[PDB]
Amino acid sequence: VQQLTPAQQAALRNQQAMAANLQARQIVLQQSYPVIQQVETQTFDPA
Amino acid sequence: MALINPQFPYAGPVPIPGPAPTETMPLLNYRVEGRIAGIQQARQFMPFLQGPHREVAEQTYYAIGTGIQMGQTFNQPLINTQEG
């Protein structure tokens, strides 16, 4: 009959936390804004 | 749904060499406790305003008054002595 691996048994006991993780990622990516910004610049001699 | 060959039948599976039986059994992976690190700030200096905007601009008004209204020197008509 059907036998689940220990990886698939863990995926059924964590399936409501994964549904809440997916719908929180969709809210973040919809309502935030991507920014790229310079944080550090330096010029050195490696000797 | 294969058809049995009656002239050349075969039997069930025989034992064969195996893949060292404990090496097909995994460990159960042992999670430690974790923490979203740091003390979070309450507010963020956002690059966009969070309120509504207006598509069109509407002209606004304010009331003003005129001034003290004076009298006038009218040009006055002639007398209707049956010519008019």
Task: Specify the resolution in Å.
Answer: 2.8
Q: How far apart are CA B68 and CA B64, in angstroms?
A: 13
Q: How far apart are CA B4 and CA B10, in angstroms?
A: 9
Min Cα–Cα distance to chain A from B3, Å: 24
Residue A30's alpha-carbon distances to A16, A27, A34, in angstroms, are 22, 5, 11
Q: How far apart are CA A21 and CA A15, in angstroms?
A: 10
Residue B74, classed as helix, strand or coil, is: coil
Q: Output the CA torsion sign for A15, A20, A21, A23.
A: positive
List the single residue in B with minimal CA-CA distance to A5.
Answer: B26
Q: Decide: A35 and B47 in contact? Cβ < 8 Å.
A: yes
Q: How far apart are CA A18 and CA B78, in angstroms?
A: 101
Radius of gyration of chain B measured on its C-alpha atoms: 52
Residue B13's alpha-carbon distances to B1, B10, B16, B62, in angstroms, are 18, 9, 9, 98
Which A positions 1-47 lie with beta carbon below 8 A of chain B?
A: 5-7, 10, 33, 35
